[PDB]
Amino acid sequence: GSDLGKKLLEAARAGRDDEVRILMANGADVNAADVVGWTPLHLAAYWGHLEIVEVLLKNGADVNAYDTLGSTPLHLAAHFGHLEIVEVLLKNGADVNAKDDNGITPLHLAANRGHLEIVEVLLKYGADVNAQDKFGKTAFDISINNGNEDLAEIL
Amino acid sequence: MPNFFIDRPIFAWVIAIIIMLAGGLAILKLPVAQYPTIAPPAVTISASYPGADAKTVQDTVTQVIEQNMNGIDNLMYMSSNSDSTGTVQITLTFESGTDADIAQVQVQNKLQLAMPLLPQEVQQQGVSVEKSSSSFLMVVGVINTDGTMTQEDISDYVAANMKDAISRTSGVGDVQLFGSQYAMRIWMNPNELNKFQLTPVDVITAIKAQNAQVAAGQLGGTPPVKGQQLNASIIAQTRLTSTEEFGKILLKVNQDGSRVLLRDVAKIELGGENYDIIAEFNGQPASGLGIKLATGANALDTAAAIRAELAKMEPFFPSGLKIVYPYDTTPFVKISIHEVVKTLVEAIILVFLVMYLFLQNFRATLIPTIAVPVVLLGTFAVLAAFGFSINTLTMFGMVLAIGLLVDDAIVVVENVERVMAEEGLPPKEATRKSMGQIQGALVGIAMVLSAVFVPMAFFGGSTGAIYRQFSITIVSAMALSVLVALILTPALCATMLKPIAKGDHGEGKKGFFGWFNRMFEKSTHHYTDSVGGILRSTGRYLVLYLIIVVGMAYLFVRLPSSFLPDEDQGVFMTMVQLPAGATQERTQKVLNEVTHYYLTKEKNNVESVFAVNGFPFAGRGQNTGIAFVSLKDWADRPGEENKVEAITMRATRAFSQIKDAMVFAFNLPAIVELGTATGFDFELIDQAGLGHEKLTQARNQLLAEAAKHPDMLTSVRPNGLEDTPQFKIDIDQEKAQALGVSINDINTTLGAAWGGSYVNDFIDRGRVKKVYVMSEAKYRMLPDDIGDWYVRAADGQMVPFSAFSSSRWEYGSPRLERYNGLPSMEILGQAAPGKSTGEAMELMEQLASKLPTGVGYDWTGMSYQERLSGNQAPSLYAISLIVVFLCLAALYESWSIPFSVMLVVPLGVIGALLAATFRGLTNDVYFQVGLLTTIGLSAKNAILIVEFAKDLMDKEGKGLIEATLDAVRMRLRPILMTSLAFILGVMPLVISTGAGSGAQNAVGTGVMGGMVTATVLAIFFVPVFFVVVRRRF
Amino acid sequence: TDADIAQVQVQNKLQLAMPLLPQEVQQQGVSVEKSSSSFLMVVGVINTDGTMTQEDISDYVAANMKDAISRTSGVGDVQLFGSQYAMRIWMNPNELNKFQLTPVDVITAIKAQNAQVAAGQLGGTPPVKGQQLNASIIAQTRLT
Amino acid sequence: GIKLATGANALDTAAAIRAELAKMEPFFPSGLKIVYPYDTTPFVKISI
Amino acid sequence: PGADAKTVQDTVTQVIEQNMNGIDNLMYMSSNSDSTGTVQITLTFESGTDADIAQVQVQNKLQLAMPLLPQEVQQQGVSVEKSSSSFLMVVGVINT
Amino acid sequence: EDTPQFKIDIDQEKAQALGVSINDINTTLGAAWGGSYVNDFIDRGRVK
Amino acid sequence: ERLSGNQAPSLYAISLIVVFLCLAALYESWSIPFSVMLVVPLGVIGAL
Amino acid sequence: LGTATGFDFELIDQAGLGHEKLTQARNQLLAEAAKHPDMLTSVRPNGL
Ligand SMILES: CO[C@H]1/C=C/O[C@@]2(C)Oc3c(C)c(O)c4c(O)c(c(C=O)c(O)c4c3C2=O)NC(=O)/C(C)=C\C=C\[C@H](C)[C@H](O)[C@@H](C)[C@@H](O)[C@@H](C)[C@H](OC(C)=O)[C@@H]1C
Ligand SMILES: CCCCCCCCCCCCCCCCCCCC(=O)O[C@H](COC(=O)CCCCCCCCCCCCCC)COP(=O)(O)OCCN
Ligand SMILES: CCCCCCCCCCCCO[C@@H]1O[C@H](CO)[C@@H](O[C@H]2O[C@H](CO)[C@@H](O)[C@H](O)[C@H]2O)[C@H](O)[C@H]1O
Ligand SMILES: CCCCCCCCCCCCO[C@@H]1O[C@H](CO)[C@@H](O[C@H]2O[C@H](CO)[C@@H](O)[C@H](O)[C@H]2O)[C@H](O)[C@H]1O
Ligand SMILES: CCCCCCCCCC[N+](C)(C)[O-]
Ligand SMILES: CCCCCCCCCCCC
Ligand SMILES: CCCCCCCC
Ligand SMILES: CCCCCC
C-alpha cells in the first residue's frame, strides 16, 4: 500500500474532517482498501461520517466498491441507519440492488434493522422489493418475522 | 545518665557488646531484597475461554465474576479486561495494610461460589487466583543451540524436569513457566471427515469414551462371601499415553468391513497447548522461568541456590540445551549492599584521619571507630525487630544517616579535648564537665530529629511505604547514636583519653602538626573577628538571608519532580505494535529486524534479545510483540553514550524508518508498580449503559479536547486497543431445522475446528497433559474454508456450512475494559513542563464534565494514591514544625530563642538545590530524604551554638555578643571536622558512574552540595539568628 | 472469633457439599456472609416524576446501584427490596398444545438460540506460511 | 437493606455508602431520588 | 474414585505438591496416594506459626492446582483442614 | 506392600461390532464390582 | 529430637555469655564474673 | 443481648419422630405453658 493511503483509512474511520481534507489535497489514494477490502468510503459509511463521504465522492471514490464479501458502502449506510449518507451515495450512482456474496441487498439490511426512512429512500431509487437472499427471503419476509407492522405496510 | 556510666565503664562496655551481638545476629537472619513491599495488595483472577472473542469472554465470564465479587473487606477498586484471545484479567486492589493472604482467600472463596455460573469450557479450563506482582527475582531462560528442539519441546522439558526442582529451591516463592507443556493435538481434516460421513462432534465423542479412567471395583470386596481368600483391586480402562494410541481410536466401521481410525481423518502429534506465542532468544527457540522471592527470604542466598540447583540438572539436559539469564536483580542487590558497606567503612577511615589531623592522638581516634560500628550494628537489630528487610531503601537510609552518627561521636570527644585544653582537668573529671554541657542538648537534638523523620512515616499509599523505610532506619540509628553518646562514649572518654595540660593548644609542637595548630588557631581568631564584624551590621545579613530564602523558593519550582531515579539496571523494553489485523508472521518480520539492530548496530553493548511474539502486553494478539534487551556489564559499557538512555533514544530513532509498524524502545522503571511521576491514570466510565460505540465516541471527544490544551496536558493516550474488523457469521435457524441439522452440532463444528476444543486429559510419561481437537492450519485461514466444513443432519446427509450460514464484515473490540463493574476506557497522560500533576488532573476533570450524558470518570492507580497522599502532606509538615519548636522551647526554656535554630533550614537547602540544578538531577525521594538529613545536621550544629551562648549568658553572666562570639569559637572545630569527613564520605557517591549510579548520585549530590552551604553559611548566620532573635524579644 | 477465619472454615466445608446440591441450586448461587442480624440502614429510592414504576425502579437499583454498594468495605449483606429484571417467557399451554410443543421444547430452543458462541479466528495460530488475514469469528450472541 | 459486616464500624461504613451513592446521583434517570427511611447512624452521630 | 495409586499420584498428588511452594514457615510435606483414590498431603509448619493463617496460605496455593486436577476429583471436593495424627480418645458403643 | 491387581482389557473393536456401548460396559462393570452411588433417600428423617 | 540436639551447644554458649555479662555489669568488674564462671564445670560434672 | 424478660426455647426432635409428631409435642407444651400465667406470659411458636 501507500503511506498516505493507509493514513486516509484511519482518518475516514475516526472522522477527522481536517485530516481527510489535507490528505485529498496531497493525493491520498481514495481506492485504498484494508485486509478485509474496506475503502475509506466503506469506513465513512459504516461510522456515519457524512461530510467525509461527500469529500471522498468528490475526489472520485468508487461508490460501488465492494469488499471481500461483496458488501458496498450503501450496504453499510443502510444497515446502520445513516439516512443522509444513503441519499448522498444514491445520488452519486450507488447500485440500489447491489448483492453481496450472500445475495443480500441494502433493502434487506435496512428492513432487518427497521429503518423506515432508509427503506423509503431505497424504494424511491428503484430497489427491487421482490429481491431474495441465498435463503429466498425477501425484505417483506424479514419484516413479518421481526414483527414490524409499519414496515410491512410499505413493502 | 552519662555520669553513671563515667564511673562504671564495664557496664557501658557490656551494653555495647550486647548491641553488637544483637546486631550481628540480625545481620545473618535479616531478609535481603532489592525493594520491599511498597505497592498495595492486588489480587488477579485470570480465566481462559479457548477460541472466544472479547465480548463472549466479557458477557459470559467477566461480568459473572465481577457480579459475585461482593462482601470482600478493604477493597479500593476493581479493574478488568477481556481480550479476543479468550482471556480475562480481573484485578482487585485492596487498601494498603490489608492481609494479602486474607484478601486473596476472600476473593478465591467468592470465585468458588460463582464457578457454577461460568460456561463449561471456562470451568474445564479453570480459573486461577494469584497475587499481582511484576517483581521477579530473576527470569531464567532455557535455549536450544543445535536446532533440534522447537520452542514447545524446550517448554515441555522445563515443565517436567526443571520447574518442580526450581520451585523446591530454598527461598523460591513462586515459579512461572514461560511456555506450555505438551498437548495431544488432533489436527482434523474436513475433506477426510466428509468422506466417511463424520464431524468434529464424533471425534470429541470417541476421544472422551476411549481416553478415560474407569472405576471398576474389587475382587472379593466387602461384604464378601465367608471363605474368600483373595482380595484384589480391578483396573479396567486407563488414559492413553502415546500418539499411536490416539491414532488407533475407532470412529466408525464401514458397511464393507473397513475401519475408520482417528489417524485417517486427522494428523496426531505432540504439540503445545497455546500457539499464540513465539519466543526466541538471539534467533533460536527459547522458554523461561519467572522466579519470585519468597516472603522473608534472602535474595542473594536464593539466587545462589537457584544456580546451584540448575548446575545439578546440567548433566541431564538434552542435546543443545543451554541456560541463559536475560533478567537478574541479584547483581544489582549485591552492588547496592557492597557500595553501602564501602561508604560506611570509608566514613570510619575518613573520621580517623580527620580526628588525628585536629586532636593528634591515637587514643581519641579509637572512640568514634568503636561508637559508629556499635550504632550501625544496633540499627540492624532494631530493623529486624520492626520486621524490616535489607533493601535498597534501608541500605541508603543508613548512608544518609552516617553524618548524624559520626557527629554524635565527634561532638562528645572534641568537647572533652577542649575542656582538658582550657582548664587542665583530668580525663575523668573533664568528661563529667564536658558531658554536663552537652547532655541536655543531645537529648533535645534527639527530640527535634524525631519530629523531622517520624511524621514522614505517616504518609499513605506507595509513597508512604517508601518514606517509612527511610523514617524508621534514620530515627532508629539517630536514637541509638544519642544513646551511645550518653552511655558508651562518656565511658570511653573518661578511661581511654590522654590528659591535656591547661593552655596547651598544640601550638608548641614541631613539624606539620605544630604548623597545623598554629594555622588553625590563627584561622579561629580570624573567624571570630569576621563574626564580630557581621554582628555589627546584622541588618545587611538579614536582607542577604531573604535573598537565600527567595533563591531556595525559586530553585524548588525549577526542579523536575520524580519518585525514584531511573537507573541502568542492564535491561530495557522494546514495544512492537503492528496495524490492527496483522498476522503473527508479519510481526516476526519486524521482530527479526529489531533483533538484527541490537545484534549489529549495538553489538558492543547488547548481550542478548528476547523476542517474544504475541506477548501479553496490548491484548496479547498476533499484531503485538516485545524485545527484552539484556545488555553487557556496566564496566564493559563506559561513557554516557553506552547507557540505556542513549541506546533507547538511538533505537527509537532508527525504528521510526520501519513503516506499518509502531516500534519504540523504553527503559524499565525502578519499581514496576509505580509507572511515571507527574503522570496520571484516568478512567472513562460508562454509567448509563450507553454501549461500546457510544463510549468510544466519548473517549475520542475527551482526547481531542485534551489535545487543544498542550500547555497543560501532554501525551494523553488511551491505554487500550481500537475496534478491529471481524467476521460475523449468522446461522439461519430456519434452514438448519429444515435440513435436520442440530444447532449444537453447527456451533461445535465451528468452535472445535476454528477455535480449538479442550476434550480431556491424557498421561505423557507420567505427566497429566491436555488433549485438543482443532482443524489443520490449511483448513481454517480464510472465509472460503467455512463452506468446506460439513455437518451431518439427522437423516445422515452431510450439509456444508455454506448452506445454512451468511457472513458479513463488521467492527468489534478486541479488548473490553471494565472499571468497578462498569464498562470503561483507561486513559494515560502527563502534565506539561512547568505544570503540576494536580493542575493536569483538574483540567481533565473540567474536560470530563463537557462529555455526553452518562459518561462518568474516576482516578485509578497512581492517581488514586496521589489524591489521598496530597491531603496528608500539609498536616505532616505542620506537625513537624510544631513539635520541633516545642522541643526547643523546653530545652532553652524560652518561646523566642527556638526561632534562632529554626532559621537554619534554608541554609542547607540552598546548596542541595544548587547542586541538583547544576548537575541536572531531579527532586526524587533520595533527594527529599537527603534534604532532611542536611537540615537535621545543620540544626544539630545550630542547637549546640545557641545552647552554649545561652548558658554563657545565664550561668557566667556574659553579654549577648560576648557569649555569642565565645560559642561560635568553641563550636568551630567540631563543625569543621564533621563536615570535612561527611563531604569526603559522600564524595565517591557523587562521582559514581557505573553500576547503580542513579541512586548513589541522588543521595550523594543532594547531601554534598547541601553540606557545603550548611557549613559555610551556618558558621556566620547562626550567630546572627541568635543575636537578632534575642534583641527582637 | 475472627469472622474472616470463621467464614473461611464454613466456606471450606460448604465446598465439599456443593457438588451434592442440585444443579438448580448451584446455578442460583450459594452465598456465605459474615453480616450482623440487624439492618445498619435502608437506602430507599423513589421517582418524584412518576416516570418509573415500582418494577422499573427496582431494576435500576439492582443494575446500577446494588453491586457497587455490595463491594463497599464494611457491607456484609445487601438486600434488594424488589427484583432485578429477567427475560420473562410467559408460556401458554393452549398455544403449546396447538403446535405439539412442551415447556421442554421452549427451554431447548432458548438454550440453542440465546447462546454466546466461541467461533474461533480466521488465520489463527498456528497459522500457515503466507497468511495476511487475522480476524475474530463472531457466531450467535446473547439476545438483548 | 444494608447489613453491617461483622466487626465493621457503623459510622465509617455509612459514610462510605453515602460517598458511593454520590457517584451514582449525577447519572440517575428523570425523577430518581435517594431517600433514607431507616438509618441507625444519625443517632450515633448526634448522641455522641 | 476407582483410580489406582499410580494414576492418583501422577494426576492429583504431583499437581498439588508442585504448587505448595514458597509457603511461609513450612517445615516438611508428607503425602500418600491410595489405590482407592484418596490423596492426603500433610504440610507441617514451624512451632509458633498461626495455624489459621497457614490454612489460608495452603488454600490459596491449592486454587492454582485445582484447574489441572481431573473433573472427577473436583466432583468429590478438595478439603483443606488443620490436622492432628493421634486420637484424644475412642468412644465405644455397645448393645448389652 | 505391592499387591496384585486384576486388569480387564475391553476390546473397542469387538464392542462396537456387536453394538454394545462402551459407556454401558463401564457402568455395568463399575456398579457391580465396585458399587455405584445412585442418589439420596430419607431414612427416618435423615438423608442417606 | 535432631533439632533439639543441634541447637543445644548454641543454647549453652549464649547462656554462659549472658550470665558472664550480667555479672560484669552488676558487680562492675572483669575478675568477679570470670572467677564465678569457673564454677560451671563443678556443677555440670555432678549433673552428668 | 435480649429484651430483659424474654427467653428463647428450642424444641428438638431427637428420635426421627417427624414433623407431625414434633408439632403435637409443641402444642402439648404450649397448652401446659398457658396453664401457668403466673410465671409464663406470651409463650408462642416462632414458626408457621
Ligand atoms: C511508563 O510505562 C510504560 C512502560 C512500563 O513498564 C512496564 C514493564 O510496566 C507496564 C505496565 C505497568 C503496564 O500497565 C503496561 C500497559 O498497560 C501496556 C503496555 C504496552 O502496550 C505496557 O508495556 C505496560 C508496561 C510495561 O512495559 N498497555 C497495554 O497493555 C494496552 C492494552 C495498550 C497499549 C497501548 C499503547 C501501545 C501504550 O499505551 C503506549 C502508548 C504507552 O503508554 C506504554 C507502552 C507506556 O510506555 C511509555 C513509554 O509511556 C508504558 C505503560
Ligand atoms: C556467639 C559468639 C559470641 C562472640 C562474642 C563473645 C562475647 C564476649 C564476652 C565478653 C568478653 C569481655 C572480655 C573483657 C576482658 C577485659 C580484660 C580483663 C582484665 C581484667 O580482668 O581486669 C579487670 C578490670 O579491668 C580494667 O580495669 C580495665 C578494663 C577496661 C574496661 C574493659 C575494656 C575492654 C573490653 C573490650 C570488649 C570488646 C568485646 C568485643 C566483642 C579486673 O579488675 P576489677 O574490676 O576486679 O578490680 C578490682 C579492684 N577494684
Ligand atoms: C559492622 C557495622 C557495619 C555493618 C555493615 C555490614 C553489614 C551490611 C550487609 C548486611 C549483611 C549482608 O547479608 C549477608 O551477606 C552475605 C555476603 O557477605 C550474603 O552471602 C550471599 O552473597 C553472595 C551473592 O552473590 C553469594 O556469593 C553467597 O553465596 C551468598 O550466600 C548473604 O546474603 C547474607 O548472609
Ligand atoms: C564572591 C566573593 C564573596 C566574598 C566572600 C564572602 C563569604 C561569605 C562569608 C561572610 C564573610 C563576611 O566577612 C566579614 O564581613 C564583615 C561585614 O559585615 C566585615 O566587617 C567589616 O565591615 C563592616 C561593614 O562595613 C563593618 O561593620 C565592620 O566594622 C568591619 O569590620 C568583616 O571584616 C569581614 O570579615
Ligand atoms: C546486661 C544485662 C543487664 C544488666 C543489668 C544489671 C544492672 C545492675 C546495676 C547495679 N548498679 C547500679 C549498682 O550498678
Ligand atoms: C539543668 C537543666 C537542664 C535542662 C534539661 C532540658 C532537657 C531537654 C529535653 C527537651 C525534650 C522535651
Ligand atoms: C541512674 C541512671 C542509670 C541509667 C541506666 C541505663 C540502663 C540502660
Ligand atoms: C515533614 C516531612 C516531609 C518528608 C519529605 C516529604
Numbering used by the authors:
A (entry chain D): 11 to 165
B (entry chain B): 1 to 1033
C (entry chain A): 98 to 241
D (entry chain A): 290 to 337
E (entry chain C): 50 to 145
F (entry chain C): 722 to 769
G (entry chain C): 866 to 913
H (entry chain A): 674 to 721
Which passages does the manuscript contain on this structure?
The E. coli AcrAB-TolC drug efflux pump contains the inner membrane H+/drug antiporter AcrB comprising three functionally interdependent protomers, cycling consecutively through the loose (L), tight (T) and open (O) state during cooperative catalysis. AcrB is the homotrimeric IM proton-motive force-driven H+/drug antiporter component which recognizes and actively transports multiple drugs (antibiotics, detergents, dyes, and solvents) via the tightly connected AcrA and TolC channels across the OM, leading to an observable resistance phenotype.
High molecular weight (HMW) drugs such as erythromycin and rifampicin bind in the AP of the L protomer along the CH2 pathway.
